[PDB]
Design a protein around this ligand. Sequence first.
Ligand SMILES: CNC(=O)c1ccc2[nH]c(C)c(C)c2c1
Length: 160
Amino acid sequence: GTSKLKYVLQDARFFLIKSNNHENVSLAKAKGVWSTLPVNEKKLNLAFRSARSVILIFSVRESGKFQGFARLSSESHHSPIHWVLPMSAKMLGGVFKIDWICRRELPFTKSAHLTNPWNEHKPVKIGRDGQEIELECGTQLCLLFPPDESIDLYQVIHKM
Ligand SMILES: CNC(=O)c1ccc2[nH]c(C)c(C)c2c1
C-alpha cells in the first residue's frame, strides 16, 4: 500500500542530492549514511530541526534517473566512509544517518510533468546538489517511484 508512505511524507521537506558516481550512492544504500559539502550540510541540519521528515532524493549525474530516496534520521556528526571523490576527502562535512524509503530507480522520463517552484519551475530533475524541492512537487515525485517491498516504514514512523 501507500498509506504509511503518505504519512511519512506529510509536511516533509525534500532536497535533490546529485552524486557524481554510482559508487557513493551504493555505499549510502549499504550503510545508511550520506555526507555533503558544508554549504549543504548547514542547510540540511537546519531543515532536520524544522520538519517532521527531511527527504533526500538521489540522482547520479548523467544517469538520467533518480536512484531512490531516504529520510534523515540525524543531524550531521563527525566510522569513516571510503567515498569516491572527483576534492580531497576533508572538504566534506559530517555524516548524516539516513533511513531508505525506496531503493528503486525512477527514470527522468517519468517525472517530466513535475516542475519545482523553488528552481524557477524547471523540471524537478534539474537542480544543483542540495536544491530544495517544494512540498507538492517533492511529494508527487516520491509517489512516482516503484514501490519498494523490501522496506517497512513502521520503524520510520516511530522516529517522527
Ligand atoms: C562539487 N561537489 C563534490 O565534489 C561533492 C559534493 C558532495 C559529495 N558527497 C559525497 C559523499 C561526495 C564524494 C561528494 C562530492
